[PDB]
Amino acid sequence: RSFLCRESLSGQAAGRPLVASVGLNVPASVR
Amino acid sequence: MTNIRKSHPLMKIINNAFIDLPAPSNISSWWNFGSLLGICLILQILTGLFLAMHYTSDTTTAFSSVTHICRDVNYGWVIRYLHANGASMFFICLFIHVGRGLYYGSYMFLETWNIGVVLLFTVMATAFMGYVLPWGQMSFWGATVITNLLSAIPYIGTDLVEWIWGGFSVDKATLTRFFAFHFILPFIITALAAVHLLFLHETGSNNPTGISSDMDKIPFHPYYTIKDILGALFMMLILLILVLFSPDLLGDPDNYTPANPLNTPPHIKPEWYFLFAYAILRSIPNKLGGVLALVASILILILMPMLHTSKQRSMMFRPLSQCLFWMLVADLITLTWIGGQPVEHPFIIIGQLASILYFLIILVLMPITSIIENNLLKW
Amino acid sequence: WLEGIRKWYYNAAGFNKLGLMRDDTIYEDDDVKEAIRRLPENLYNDRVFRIKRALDLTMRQQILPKEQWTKYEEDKFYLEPYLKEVIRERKEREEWAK
Amino acid sequence: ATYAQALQSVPETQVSQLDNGLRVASEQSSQPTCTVGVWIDAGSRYENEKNNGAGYFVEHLAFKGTKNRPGSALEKEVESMGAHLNAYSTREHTAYYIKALSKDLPKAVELLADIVQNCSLEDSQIEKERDVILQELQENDSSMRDVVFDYLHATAFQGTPLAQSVEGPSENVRKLSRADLTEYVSQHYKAPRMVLAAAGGVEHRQLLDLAQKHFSSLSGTYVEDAVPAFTPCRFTGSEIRHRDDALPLAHVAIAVEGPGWANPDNVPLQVANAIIGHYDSTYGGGTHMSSTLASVAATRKLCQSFQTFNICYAETGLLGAHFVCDNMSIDDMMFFLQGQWMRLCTSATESEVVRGKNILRNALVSHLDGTTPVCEDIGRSLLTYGRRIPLAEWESRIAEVDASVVREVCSKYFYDQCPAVAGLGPIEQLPDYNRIRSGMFWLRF
Amino acid sequence: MLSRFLGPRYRELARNWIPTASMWGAVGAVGLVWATDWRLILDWVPYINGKF
Amino acid sequence: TLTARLYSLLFRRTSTFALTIAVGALFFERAFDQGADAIYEHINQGKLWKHIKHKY
Numbered sequence A: 001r002s003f004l005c006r007e008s009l010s011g012q013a014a015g016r017p018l019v020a021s022v023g024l025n026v027p028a029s030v031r
Numbered sequence B: 001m002t003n004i005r006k007s008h009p010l011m012k013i014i015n016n017a018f019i020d021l022p023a024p025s026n027i028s029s030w031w032n033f034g035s036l037l038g039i040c041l042i043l044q045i046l047t048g049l050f051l052a053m054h055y056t057s058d059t060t061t062a063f064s065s066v067t068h069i070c071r072d073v074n075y076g077w078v079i080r081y082l083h084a085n086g087a088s089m090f091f092i093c094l095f096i097h098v099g100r101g102l103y104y105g106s107y108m109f110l111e112t113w114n115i116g117v118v119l120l121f122t123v124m125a126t127a128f129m130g131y132v133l134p135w136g137q138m139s140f141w142g143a144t145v146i147t148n149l150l151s152a153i154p155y156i157g158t159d160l161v162e163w164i165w166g167g168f169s170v171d172k173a174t175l176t177r178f179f180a181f182h183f184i185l186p187f188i189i190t191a192l193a194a195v196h197l198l199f200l201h202e203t204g205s206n207n208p209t210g211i212s213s214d215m216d217k218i219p220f221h222p223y224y225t226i227k228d229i230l231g232a233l234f235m236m237l238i239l240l241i242l243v244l245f246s247p248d249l250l251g252d253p254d255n256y257t258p259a260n261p262l263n264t265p266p267h268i269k270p271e272w273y274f275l276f277a278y279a280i281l282r283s284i285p286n287k288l289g290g291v292l293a294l295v296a297s298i299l300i301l302i303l304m305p306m307l308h309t310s311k312q313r314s315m316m317f318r319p320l321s322q323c324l325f326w327m328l329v330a331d332l333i334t335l336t337w338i339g340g341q342p343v344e345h346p347f348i349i350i351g352q353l354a355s356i357l358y359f360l361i362i363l364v365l366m367p368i369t370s371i372i373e374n375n376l377l378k379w
Numbered sequence C: 001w002l003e004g005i006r007k008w009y010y011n012a013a014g015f016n017k018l019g020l021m022r023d024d025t026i027y028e029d030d031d032v033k034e035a036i037r038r039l040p041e042n043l044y045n046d047r048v049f050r051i052k053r054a055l056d057l058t059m060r061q062q063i064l065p066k067e068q069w070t071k072y073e074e075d076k077f078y079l080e081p082y083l084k085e086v087i088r089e090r091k092e093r094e095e096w097a098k
Numbered sequence D: 001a002t003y004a005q006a007l008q009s010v011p012e013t014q015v016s017q018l019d020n021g022l023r024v025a026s027e028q029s030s031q032p033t034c035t036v037g038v039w040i041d042a043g044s045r046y047e048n049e050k051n052n053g054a055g056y057f058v059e060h061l062a063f064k065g066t067k068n069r070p071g072s073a074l075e076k077e078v079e080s081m082g083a084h085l086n087a088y089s090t091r092e093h094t095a096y097y098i099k100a101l102s103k104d105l106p107k108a109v110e111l112l113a114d115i116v117q118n119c120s121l122e123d124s125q126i127e128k129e130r131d132v133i134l135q136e137l138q139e140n141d142s143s144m145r146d147v148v149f150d151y152l153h154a155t156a157f158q159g160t161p162l163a164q165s166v167e168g169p170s171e172n173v174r175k176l177s178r179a180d181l182t183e184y185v186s187q188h189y190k191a192p193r194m195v196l197a198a199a200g201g202v203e204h205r206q207l208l209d210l211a212q213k214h215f216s217s218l219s220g221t222y223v224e225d226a227v228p229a230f231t232p233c234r235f236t237g238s239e240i241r242h243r244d245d246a247l248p249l250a251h252v253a254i255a256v257e258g259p260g261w262a263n264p265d266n267v268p269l270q271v272a273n274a275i276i277g278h279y280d281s282t283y284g285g286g287t288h289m290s291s292t293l294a295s296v297a298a299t300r301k302l303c304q305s306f307q308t309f310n311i312c313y314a315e316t317g318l319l320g321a322h323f324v325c326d327n328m329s330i331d332d333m334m335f336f337l338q339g340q341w342m343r344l345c346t347s348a349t350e351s352e353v354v355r356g357k358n359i360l361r362n363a364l365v366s367h368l369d370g371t372t373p374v375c376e377d378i379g380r381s382l383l384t385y386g387r388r389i390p391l392a393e394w395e396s397r398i399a400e401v402d403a404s405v406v407r408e409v410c411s412k413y414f415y416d417q418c419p420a421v422a423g424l425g426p427i428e429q430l431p432d433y434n435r436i437r438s439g440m441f442w443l444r445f
Numbered sequence E: 001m002l003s004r005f006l007g008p009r010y011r012e013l014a015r016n017w018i019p020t021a022s023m024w025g026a027v028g029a030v031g032l033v034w035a036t037d038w039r040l041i042l043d044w045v046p047y048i049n050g051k052f
Numbered sequence F: 001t002l003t004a005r006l007y008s009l010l011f012r013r014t015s016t017f018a019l020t021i022a023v024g025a026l027f028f029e030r031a032f033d034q035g036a037d038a039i040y041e042h043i044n045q046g047k048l049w050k051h052i053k054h055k056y
């Protein structure tokens, strides 16, 4: 998504180390 | 900037068909018969045209017009006997083609094999009608005998005969009807042959070894065009020997007599390329059973791909199946010989034995042999 | 005994004369094609070369000299495990679809 | 402790109702946290063409300022106790929920009372908020799934309030003054059409007395006479194609009329939907997934991601699928996806129906994990069904579903029904509407 | 072949498609009687038999 | 409306659609043959052989 606003951009920063996850019937996720 | 060979639509189709088509390297001579069929077809389409250009279709001028083509038309006899014996050449090539497809396990190409069976039926019907055309004694009486089989069909059967006869017996109506059908059918055969080549090209030819040869593939044009030219030369040698030296070798002399419905010839035999099946007809006293066996004798090729039980595809490495296949070929030859001879001792019992053995070999002996065969090779 | 009959059959089959191994002569159905794809590279390369040499020999209608004939004892069984596994997987799929 | 034993041991959903009409509903557990929110029945459905976009604007300005808390002070109270305050507005419901500890319940309920009631709606903040929504509109334009679903709603319920997008056209948002919003608040934020929900370490008696002492000022009247009624929405089977070849991937959503929140046919259809399944390029199941469409897509690398949906409104819904795939796959899935639906309409084996039942049970039990999903479930169920469906009832309704039921309900909703296709991107290969409608019926059946 | 197609769910599919296949066969029978003008059957249908 | 009942009964299934078409073929063929033949005999009354065979 394109972000061009403070409110939408809020929360897109990271404060915890990156954590990937893949499944068998669930799409890939990251945090 | 490109080859018009591989960019022009028609030229692209021709190129993919028989110029740059990947063909197996080790294709034996037995494959040449494929083209030897098509060439025959072309010849049969050619000469027949020049026959239909001097052939009437009325029963008062059928035989006379044929004699006119033979005696008066400039070089007409060449065309007439070229047609008559090119039919036999066509059927020799057809039988050898079916034998090749059977031996090397080419029936695994299901679509091409089924289309081939359809082509076989169409060619046999066309040849039957063509032999009816000259209105000889053999012509008329064989037509009556063959069409009267359809009376055995339950219920509709009788009506069907009166439908095809266009009346009550093979007569004026049936002659012209068979002329029209014999004219139209070969073009249907050509269309089916084109479809057949399409289906075969979707997978590629099968080599004698029966194994996929995608690694050793060679272009068709520089090699197999000249191989096919040599095959056509040999077939022309045989056909021209037949026509020029002994034209009435494969025919029957009684066919040179005007058709007289009030008297029959001493023997009523069909053309040679049909006797193998006619004998089967004569095997079963039950007329309906006879007709059913007659149809099944050809329709068995449809079931043949299903019955394949051997792990290997071809017969190159199956000696037991090789002896079985040659038993089958000898059986077909025996049926052909039996068909000619009259219904007398010992031809009756020999005919029953041959007819039984044919289906026994195709349906039972071959699959069981393949089952023993795999067991003999750890699989 | 039986193994003598099997050896006689291997001799009379003829694929040894072409340098072919048993598994090179098998018909390539879908299961066999997938098994061939599953083969390790080193086995696949030898399979392809053996097949191509055999096709060459049959094109020229010849056989290898008697010394270079795949002996019955030396006829390894490379495609058998992969084909067995493929058949097992297909059987499992069919049983689950049942 | 078998599945059935656990189901009849899930805490209940005690429901109360003050005199004004505000329904209080809680669900006690042992967690030290809680999730308290107010679920109003506002949404784009209750909006005319003149003021479409009012609900989004009100949601934007909710947390900005109040009469009691002038502004950022409200955010300070929310953050000081560690609560996360959120709000989601849809085409039917609009809700505010605070995620906070159990001890902060008296304060959290007060904060929600202030927002839903004494909202400032200052004109300066309205002007500031006007641009933000406009930017968010372009952001949503970048969100291709969302624009495809809005195309679905626009082309399906054309000429009805449902076709209106939640955010509103980027012309109404540029003229929505204070006057329009105030009517929205005073006409939709009413006590009868409100559910005060909470879940976690919440006590139903505590929630009731907090509601009595805070939300008592809520009004149930509707000013002079104006009572916004429920307008039934027609579903007009149509198609819309916004072909933009620049977009890397093509999105196509096709849906037929599904039932409403009532009409228990949802339970069979969901099972049927579960049989179709869902796929993404990063799954890992590959050519082994039980779903036929998923297995085919993985085998041929057809699509990047297909998902089946059952969007459901009060009286009608959009039941169907939405898939994202390249230019030379759109037709092919149209063949398979439709080919899947009709299979369930003509021959649905009991094995796959059992599989769908298990998938549905897993989805329901997993979706109700955590205080926030439970609070959302309570607030949504009290507005849609009028009561929270206990999981045991869900289990019973799922158990009654079998192969014959799925076949009957699919043939009743899928077979020979005009779809509502909507496509975006390089959708050239997308079959013409006549082709899709033809694919909606099988010549074997 | 027949080992694979002999299954619980396979017979269940057969049962599902029994009505459609059977009345497809009825369609074929009626079409055959009509096109052929099978007098043996058409002599019993009330209105149509007046044609003969 | 009757048309809804027709659709739900005889038209939803393609095969039932074909059966309806087939029976309609019978009855339409008979009815149309009767009607057209009657119209023709009415138009040319007294000229056809059917109308004059009685006197021989």
Ligand code: HEM
Pocket (backbone or CB within 6 Å): B030, B031, B032, B033, B034, B035, B037, B038, B041, B094, B097, B098, B101, B104, B106, B107, B109, B112, B113, B114, B115, B116, B117, B118, B119, B120, B123, B189, B193, B196, B200, B204, B205, B206, B207, B301
């Ligand atoms: C009208 C007569 C026929 C024509 C013109 C024709 C044409 C051809 C041609 C040109 C080929 C390629 C050359 C070859 O492999 O032989 C071929 C292949 C083939 N034909 Fe025919 N054919 C005819 C009849 C039949 C019949 C009767 C059958 C058997 C039912 C058949 C089955 C096959 C098979 C199996 C192949 C593939 C052979 C292989 O891959 O080894 N054909 N056909």
Ligand code: HEM
Pocket (backbone or CB within 6 Å): B041, B044, B045, B046, B047, B048, B049, B050, B051, B052, B055, B066, B080, B083, B084, B087, B090, B123, B126, B127, B130, B131, B132, B133, B134, B182, B183, B186, B187, B189, B251
């Ligand atoms: C499929 C290829 C064909 C075959 C196998 C075939 C076979 C035959 C046979 C066996 C005869 C009887 C020969 C005899 O009198 O002893 C014949 C005659 C005849 N055929 Fe064909 N034919 C074929 C194609 C054609 C075509 C395409 C035409 C039309 C252009 C045609 C026209 C005729 C005519 C006019 C006769 C009567 C002349 C005569 O019998 O000598 N044929 N055909």
